[PDB]
From a paper:
Isoniazid (INH), a successful frontline TB drug for more than 50 years, targets the NADH‐dependent 2‐trans enoyl–acyl carrier protein (ACP) reductase InhA. This is a key enzyme in the Mtb cell wall synthesis pathway and does not have a human orthologue. InhA inhibitors are known to modulate the tertiary structure of the InhA protein binding pocket, in particular the substrate binding loop (SBL).
Crystals suitable for structure determination were obtained for fragments 4, 9, 12, 22, 24 and 34 bound to InhA. However, the pyrazole rings occupy the same sub‐pocket, stack against the nicotinamide ring of NADH, and the 2‐N‐pyrazole provides an H‐bond interaction with the 20‐OH group of NADH. In contrast, pyrazole 4 (pIC50<3) has a slightly altered binding mode, where the hydroxy group has an additional interaction with Met98 backbone NH.
Residue numbers in the entry:
A (entry chain A), B (entry chain A), C (entry chain A), D (entry chain A): 3 to 269
The structure:
Amino acid sequence: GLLDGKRILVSGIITDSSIAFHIARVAQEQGAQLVLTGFDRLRLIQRITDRLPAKAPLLELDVQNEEHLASLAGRVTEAIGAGNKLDGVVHSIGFMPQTGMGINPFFDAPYADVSKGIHISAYSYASMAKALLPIMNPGGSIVGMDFDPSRAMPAYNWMTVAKSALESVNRFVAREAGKYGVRSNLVAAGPIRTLAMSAIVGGALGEEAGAQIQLLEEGWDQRAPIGWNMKDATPVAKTVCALLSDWLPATTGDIIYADGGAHTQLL
Amino acid sequence: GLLDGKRILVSGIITDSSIAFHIARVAQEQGAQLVLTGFDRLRLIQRITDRLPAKAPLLELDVQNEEHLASLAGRVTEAIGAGNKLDGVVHSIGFMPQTGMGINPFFDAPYADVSKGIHISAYSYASMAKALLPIMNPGGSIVGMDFDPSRAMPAYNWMTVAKSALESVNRFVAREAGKYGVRSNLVAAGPIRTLAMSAIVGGALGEEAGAQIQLLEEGWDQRAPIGWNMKDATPVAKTVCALLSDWLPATTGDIIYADGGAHTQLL
Amino acid sequence: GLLDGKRILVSGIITDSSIAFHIARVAQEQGAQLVLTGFDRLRLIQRITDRLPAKAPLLELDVQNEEHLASLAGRVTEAIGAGNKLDGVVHSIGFMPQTGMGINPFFDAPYADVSKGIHISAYSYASMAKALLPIMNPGGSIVGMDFDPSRAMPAYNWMTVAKSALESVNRFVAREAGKYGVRSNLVAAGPIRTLAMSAIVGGALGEEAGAQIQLLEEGWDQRAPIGWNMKDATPVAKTVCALLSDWLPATTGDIIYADGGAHTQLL
Amino acid sequence: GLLDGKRILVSGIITDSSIAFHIARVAQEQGAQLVLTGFDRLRLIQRITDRLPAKAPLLELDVQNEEHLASLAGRVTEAIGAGNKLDGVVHSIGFMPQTGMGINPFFDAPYADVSKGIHISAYSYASMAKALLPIMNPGGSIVGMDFDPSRAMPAYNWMTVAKSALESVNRFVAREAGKYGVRSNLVAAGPIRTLAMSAIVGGALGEEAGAQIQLLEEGWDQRAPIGWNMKDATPVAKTVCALLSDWLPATTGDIIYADGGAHTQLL
Ligand SMILES: NC(=O)c1ccc[n+]([C@@H]2O[C@H](COP(=O)([O-])OP(=O)(O)OC[C@H]3O[C@@H](n4cnc5c(N)ncnc54)[C@H](O)[C@@H]3O)[C@@H](O)[C@H]2O)c1
Ligand SMILES: NC(=O)c1ccc[n+]([C@@H]2O[C@H](COP(=O)([O-])OP(=O)(O)OC[C@H]3O[C@@H](n4cnc5c(N)ncnc54)[C@H](O)[C@@H]3O)[C@@H](O)[C@H]2O)c1
Ligand SMILES: NC(=O)c1ccc[n+]([C@@H]2O[C@H](COP(=O)([O-])OP(=O)(O)OC[C@H]3O[C@@H](n4cnc5c(N)ncnc54)[C@H](O)[C@@H]3O)[C@@H](O)[C@H]2O)c1
Ligand SMILES: NC(=O)c1ccc[n+]([C@@H]2O[C@H](COP(=O)([O-])OP(=O)(O)OC[C@H]3O[C@@H](n4cnc5c(N)ncnc54)[C@H](O)[C@@H]3O)[C@@H](O)[C@H]2O)c1
Ligand SMILES: OCc1ccc(Cn2cccn2)cc1
Ligand SMILES: OCc1ccc(Cn2cccn2)cc1
Ligand SMILES: OCc1ccc(Cn2cccn2)cc1
Ligand SMILES: OCc1ccc(Cn2cccn2)cc1
């Protein structure tokens, strides 16, 4: 397999439609040994991850909790065994309060809400790298999930701003990770119909926002020279595994686009 | 003059080396009528602005203070006279706690500090546009100050991340400003020897950081096809005035580089 | 006026809908003294330019003709008077054979045709700078016309490739121009309904291509936060004059977008 | 292996230091069955390729020769067997006459020389895709070699312009390739000490140019968070194989940077 013998931490599983569930599944099909991290609903996450090809230890991780971050490396070492280190880390964590996305005017998002969204979606990429680089092997790889924020778009609003901050954070994380012989990169995915995105398209954050995201999804598939299937996270999961492998060894502080090539076409 | 008859708000003056002092001076030499905003040290700011070519009303504005923002439009209207609106707005506000810049490791900046820096340096660009767009004329212009964060660099650290967030915020502010017939853009300046930057180069944030910024300044002038004079904010001030004028009427959500062309050259 | 006392060469006038006709008109309204260059149909160009606010000498210039380029500086000096130099140069020249644009498959453009298009549209920006920099004043400005080629698009095909080459050429021209104290930049315009573009939208290069360009024009205005009027070259002409002025003195090897801000928005 | 069962065409081998020699070696170590194409010195290329892990048929291909291109698909089919198609294509072809690189002034490169360089280095990426897409399998991959031309640099001169044209061509090739279920991408490599580059650094194109390229190589390794070894093409070859594999299935019209992450850092 592509990831034979590799020990990889995967964060971000919440439902069977989480991009991280598909990253974890593909990594296990490719021979990786996983450690999973989950936020808040651990009973649910364990029941979800019981469907993965192989059993994997699940550790609690709230990226806003300094105690969870400070104990993380020790908890991972206990799970993978003393003397063993991680070869890979997957950050698949994103959050923005409802005031920062959808029909709520861009100017009406309170800073406490924007700040919480940037903490979870951008700053935590650095918090995770800080916690785990001391237990990572040379040749290792840290991968985060991105949504191309180079241009503004309707409805995504402050989540796009958080992704711009994440892209910048990734370039700095690469400088630090390089000292350990570790790569840091993001995968910029096309839109995926997770449970939350299906709810948003269905109008959970207002009708106009849902209508705008549905048009954006259609336009994405139209622009993509190879098409874009929003119901299929497998091409995104494969791309993350490519970055976790030894096959992109000179790429760091960078962004790989798993978007059907849509960002390279105007119409 | 380039800005004859225009009513322009200019924030960010703290010393006679502030980029905003030079923006204000050039705008007044070009016939603009100014309203100034100042943070915390109003007695100092008034004494500084007494050196400007023309007298201008000074209003207090702490961008973290919601009361200051909510009363801002009314305070500006009182200063410029009922029935008059602003033609231009200059955001020349930037801050990052010492833990987020210099020799302090990138991973050691606490989130409360990063969050305060992003609030002042990025979110406030939207807070200012929210407060002032209701009192801006069609054909108007909002300009913010940027430092090219497309690539990571030593010492600037979390200030670079805040600039990446600002660039993203500017693209969204342009969408909102467009409804008022108003443009929103940033000027990405080359490094300027303000009092704070001179202190930083002098080692105020650690020796290695000072050494790295001095090398970055030298490299900037070397790469710039027309050179770069860090002791001269006038070319930056002129660029801001170009954006405040009627001469870039189809440019919005964008970035104009006043950096001697250094970002267009590798060596 | 914005360009009072400036001596500016303007190439590219062919009809009253040429972007260069509007650049020339605005520059003259702003006090510039012009020298015009025209290709092949000089009687037509003289009759067109008789409509400009002021009379201006017209010189023949085929950018593929080495003799025209070698004699150009001497012919301009004769027109503006010995001892006088140019302050500005406008390159508003673009060409691509019909095999390289429209419904003709991208793979069916013969290299002789692509090469002629790149010679006229990209290489000539350097040929013009070579010919005219020896007769340009310090503080001078060279401006070329661009159409954002960062992403592929239907119908524009090899003209987009020629614009990518032009953007690269502009960065090198800036290095050379800098030695003379001269700036080099491009204005990336939104789509303009010139006589040729109206014919193309009308199906002159095939129906599907015309349909695609009409959809691209509509999408441009929709994405533009301040809108985009394809029938109005005046905002583009104003932007060129901004770059020819003393108000963007630290910008070189760069691209200014006069496109209503459309390139900064995805939808 | 990563490329087990895949039939891949590899162009561009001239010496044992050619990036394509290392692409071919890695692809064979990874189970690919190769067809090689060589220009002009076929006896030399055969002797070089005798050192590859496995024997591979060698076909003549001058990309400026229309007869070679028109017969290419038939010659490849004859080599791989009737009923078999290619899964991958590697374009590792680049050329620029000496007048277009080095100390020769940028303005002194005759257009016939620039045109030949753009034909071989950029247009041929489309010529190759045209010839080979009719004999490529769905899920297939076309990869070309790039050198980041986003910013101008000393000495590389018109070769950089040819790479800007190549990047644009790649975006259009992706549109065409997509109709066949085929991806098109470029690998932007850091500087590699091929025989020609060693000669150039040694002063073959002038002393100043050699000095500038040596400084650029040093700066590249300094900026790279994981370092950059110019004497090692293996990380570049691995990246090309990653794109030829099934592990980046949603990436097209794009650029993957195998440069040690140097393009993501300013200093
Ligand atoms: N769905 C899309 O269209 C799309 C597109 C591009 C990128 N992404 C990104 O992919 C990543 C994964 O999101 P997803 O779409 O699979 O959605 P998801 O809801 O399945 O996953 C997001 C995860 O973030 C976790 N999380 C939230 N707050 C946390 C905290 N305080 N500590 C730790 N974990 C926390 C959640 O528990 C959840 O597991 C995110 O970064 C998202 O922005 C999504
Ligand atoms: N100096 C450089 O090299 C450089 C380069 C590019 C961009 N910039 C940007 O230019 C802008 C102006 O900075 P400068 O370099 O002139 O420095 P400065 O210290 O003179 O100005 C920064 C201003 O921010 C103000 N400020 C801080 N916190 C505030 C708050 N809570 N509310 C309101 N105002 C607040 C300060 O009072 C000060 O007037 C900033 O955005 C900065 O990031 C500076
Ligand atoms: N029209 C648009 O939508 C649009 C958008 C962006 C940029 N542009 C660019 O603006 C510039 C001006 O074009 P336009 O749209 O006004 O069209 P146009 O037809 O009015 O002007 C193009 C000019 O190129 C000249 N030209 C062609 N071959 C020449 C040669 N061998 N030597 C000298 N001059 C030669 C023509 O004589 C003509 O004056 C071009 O670079 C074009 O690509 C156009
Ligand atoms: N060496 C570097 O530093 C570097 C960096 C980035 C990208 N590249 C690119 O990598 C690719 C391979 O070049 P390289 O550095 O290995 O050098 P190289 O000299 O080993 O290979 C270039 C190849 O181009 C071939 N070629 C030239 N004219 C041709 C024609 N008319 N028809 C067919 N083939 C022709 C040559 O025969 C040779 O095999 C080129 O695209 C080059 O620009 C090189
Ligand atoms: O908390 C709100 C929220 C989180 C994540 C997503 C997924 N996503 C889409 C684009 C970027 N991320 C969507 C909403
Ligand atoms: O609060 C710390 C601080 C604020 C502003 C500056 C100026 N600057 C340089 C680059 C970007 N901004 C520098 C330090
Ligand atoms: O010779 C064919 C031709 C020349 C110029 C144009 C204008 N243009 C549109 C986009 C870029 N340039 C269009 C066709
Ligand atoms: O024909 C001259 C020539 C060809 C290829 C190279 C390799 N290269 C370096 C950067 C881009 N390509 C260098 C010179």
